[PDB]
Ligand binder design. Structure first.
Ligand SMILES: [Zn+2]
Ligand SMILES: [Zn+2]
Lengths: 13, 188
C-alpha cells in the first residue's frame, strides 16, 4: 500500500 | 452489620464500584478511573492526568516524539547498531486514535517491538496490529492486539509478548545501520 516512511532517531538510556 | 462494602479509591473521580476489602486492592489496579501516567519510555517524566490530557502532555513535554497519519506506515529506526539500552518512539494516527510505536534494544542483545493504543483496554480490543521486517525474499511478522497505555508495555516486553529479535536477525533486515519496520493497524 501507499506507505509514508518516517525516520526515528534513537535515545540512549 | 453483617459485613461492609468499601468504595474504590477512585470513587471521587467517578468509580461507582463498591467492594469487600479482600478484593478492593485487586479492583483498584484494574480500575479504569485510575489516572493515566506518562507512556514514554524513560520515566524522567512523572506526569499524571486524565486520558483526554495525555495527547496534549506529549504535545507539550515530548515535542521530539513525532506523528504520522496513516493505517500503513514504515517505522525506520536509525542507528540500530548503537550499543546498550536504546529506545525508538513515534506515533501513528489512524481510525481517529493515536497509537504509540515502540522499539527497545535491551542490554545483555535483544530488540522488542510493540504497539500501544492511547486509549482504554476496551478500545484497544477493537484493533489489531501487524509488525513486519522485510529483506530479499525474507519476512518476519508479528500480529497481536495493541495494549492500552493504561496497562503499559513493560510486562508484555518481559514476557516476550511482542515481536522479539536479536542483533543477528537485525542484520538480515537492516540497510546502512537502519531498520525499517512495517507497521499496519486495522479494526476488528
Ligand atoms: Zn474503581
Ligand atoms: Zn511525560
Amino acid at each position: 500500500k501507499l506507505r509514508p516512511v518516517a525516520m526515528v532517531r534513537p535515545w540512549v538510556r | 452489620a453483617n459485613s461492609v462494602l468499601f468504595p474504590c479509591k477512585y470513587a471521587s473521580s467517578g468509580c461507582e464500584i463498591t467492594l469487600p476489602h479482600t478484593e478492593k486492592a485487586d479492583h483498584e489496579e484494574l480500575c479504569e478511573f485510575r489516572p493515566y501516567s506518562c507512556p514514554c519510555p524513560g520515566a524522567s517524566c512523572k506526569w499524571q492526568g486524565s486520558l483526554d490530557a495525555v495527547m496534549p502532555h506529549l504535545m507539550h513535554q515530548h515535542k521530539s516524539i513525532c506523528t504520522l497519519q496513516g493505517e500503513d506506515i514504515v517505522f525506520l529506526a536509525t542507528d540500530i547498531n548503537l550499543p546498550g539500552a536504546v529506545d525508538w518512539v513515534m506515533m501513528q494516527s489512524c481510525f481517529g486514535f493515536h497509537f504509540m510505536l515502540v522499539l527497545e534494544k535491551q542490554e545483555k542483545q535483544q530488540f522488542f517491538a510493540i504497539v500501544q493504543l492511547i486509549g482504554t483496554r476496551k478500545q484497544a480490543e477493537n484493533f489489531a496490529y501487524r509488525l513486519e521486517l522485510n529483506g530479499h525474499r525474507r519476512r518476519l511478522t508479528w500480529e497481536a492486539t495493541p495494549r492500552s497505555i493504561h496497562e503499559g508495555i513493560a510486562t508484555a516486553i518481559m514476557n516476550s509478548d511482542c515481536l522479539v529479535f536479536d542483533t543477528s536477525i537485525a542484520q538480515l533486515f537492516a540497510e546502512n545501520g537502519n531498520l525499517g519496520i512495517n507497521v499496519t493497524i486495522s479494526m476488528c
